[PDB]
Assembly symmetry: C2
Homo-oligomer: 69 residues x 2
């Protein structure tokens, strides 16, 4: 039904929000510290000097294990 | 249709996977460091000396800003 189409769209949007903001292909699993923005996969987070969201200096990257992985 | 019911169940499970595994009421937004398990809200994470997934000591809690928030 039309309701099935609405639910498919909600699911698709939530799943897309879990993907890396740089490559759009891999799941987010890395946090820039200390700011806390968690928006990249490990590969894309590895060479950024500053956060792509807030511009804060990246002191290090913390790996995150999420139940949605 | 029956697919509407199946999609409602998938969406409910994905949403539940984003809620704190301890209180079940607030969104996950905290990482136990250094292990990286990101399973709690800030209120539950502040009360745990050991990670509830792996039992490693919590040295500190890192707040995470996720695009799904
Ligand atoms: Zn990436
Ligand atoms: Zn940031
Ligand atoms: Zn909680
Ligand atoms: Zn742990």
């Amino acid at each position: 039904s039309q309701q099935t189409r609405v639910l498919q769209e909600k699911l698709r949007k939530l799943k897309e929000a879990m993907l890396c903001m740089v490559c759009c292909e891999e799941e987010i699993n890395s946090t820039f510290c200390p700011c806390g923005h968690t928006v990249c996969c490990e590969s894309c987070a590895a060479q950024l000097q500053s956060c792509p969201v807030c511009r804060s200096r990246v002191e290090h990257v913390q790996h995150v294990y999420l139940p949605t992985h």
